[PDB]
Amino acid sequence: GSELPQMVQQLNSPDQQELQSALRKLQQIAMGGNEQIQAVIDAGALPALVQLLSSPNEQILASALGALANIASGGNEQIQAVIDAGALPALVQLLSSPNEQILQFALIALANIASGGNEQIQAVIDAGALPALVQLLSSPNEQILQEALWALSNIASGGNEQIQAVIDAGALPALVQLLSSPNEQILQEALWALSNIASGGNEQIQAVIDAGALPALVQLLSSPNEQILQEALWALSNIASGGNEQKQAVKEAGALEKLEQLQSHENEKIQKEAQEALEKLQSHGSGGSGKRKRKAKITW
C-alpha cells in the first residue's frame, strides 16, 4: 500500500542503508505473486532497478538483480514491462561478469524473462544473449552451467524461429554431450533443453537427430531413476511427433522394444508416457510435442 512509493524513492537515497533496505523490501514483496508484483511495477520501481544494474556496488547490484528476477517471475506483461524499462542490455553485459554470484543472478533474471511469451523470448535473442549462453555451456562451474542451461531451455520453449536461433547459435553439440553427464541435475536440464528444441518443426527435430541425440536418449530408457526416465521419454516423445524421417530415425535407434516394455512399468506416468511415444511412432501424422518453461525466485 502507501509505503511502496517511499521504497521506490529510496532507490535513489543518498543514505546507502536506506537504499539497501528499500531494495531488499521490494525484492521480498515481489516474492508474493503477480498482484504484489503489479503493485511494485505501478509504484514506478522499474526504471530505478534497471539503473542500479550499472552500480559498481555489488550489494546493490545483487539485490537489484534479485528484485528484477522476482518481478520477471510474473505474467508475460509484467515481464514485458521489465524489457521495456531497458533491463536486457545490462543483463546481457552482466553475462561477462567475473563475479560468479552476480553472473548466477543475471542468468536467473534472464531465464525468467525468457519464460514469457514468444515476443519476450525474441527480445532476449535480439539483445544478443545466445552466444554468451552457449559459451557458458563450457563452464566447469556447475552452478553457472545449471543457470545457463535453464536460460537456453526457456528460449527454446518459444516458437520455431526462437528454437532455430538456439540451433544457429551452436548449442546442440554441447547439449548432446551433456546427456553423458554423471550429474543428474545437469542431465535433467540438458534433457529439458533438447526436448524443447525437439518441440519445433520437423527440421528442428531433425537437427536434434543429426547432432547425435538418439543413442544417448535410448540408453537413458534403461535408467532406474524414474525422474530421468520420464525426462528421456518426454524427449523421445517430442522427436516422435515429427514426420516419417524423424519417426524412422527413432525406430532405427532401437527405441520400439524399450518403449513397449516401459508400458509395463509400475509407475503410471512412465506407462502413459511410453504408450504415447509408442503410438506416435506407429501412427501416420504428426504433432503433439510439449514445451516446458522454468521460473525461479531469488530470495535471501
The rounded distance, in Å, linking the Cα atoms of 187 and 178 is: 6
Q: How far is the CB of 187 from Ca ion (least distance, A)?
A: 8
Q: Least CB distance from residue 145 to Ca ion, whole Å?
A: 8
* Binds Ca ion (CB under 5 A): choice among 2, 17, 182, 287: 182
The radius of gyration computed from the CA coordinates of the chain, to the nearest angstrom, equals 21
Q: From 113, 99, 177, select the one nearest 144 (Cα to Cα).
A: 99
Candidates 2, 17, 224, 300: give the one binding Ca ion (CB under 5 A).
224
Residues 148-167 that bind Ca ion (CB under 5 A): none
CB of 103 to Ca ion, least distance (A): 8
Q: How far out from the chain centre does Cα 183 lie?
A: 18
Measured CA to CA, the distance from residue 45 to residue 200 in angstroms comes to 37
Region binding Ca ion by CB under 5 A among candidate stretches 29-37, 98-106, 120-128, 286-294: 98-106
CB atoms within 10 A of CB 157: 26
140 sits near Ca ion (criterion: CB under 5 A): yes
Q: Is 17 in the site for Ca ion (CB under 5 A)?
A: no
For Ca ion, the binding residues in 264-283 under the rule CB under 5 A are none
Q: Which stretch binds Ca ion (CB under 5 A): 11-19, 106-114, 202-210, 272-280?
A: 11-19
Compute the least distance from the CB of residue 186 to Ca ion, in Å.
9
Q: Check binding of 287 to Ca ion (CB under 5 A).
A: no
Q: What is the DSSP secondary-structure string of 80-134?
A: HHHHHTTHHHHHHHHTT-S-HHHHHHHHHHHHHHTTS-HHHHHHHHHTTHHHHHH
Cell of 183: 550429474
Contacts with Ca ion by CB under 5 A lie at: 14, 56, 98, 140, 182, 224
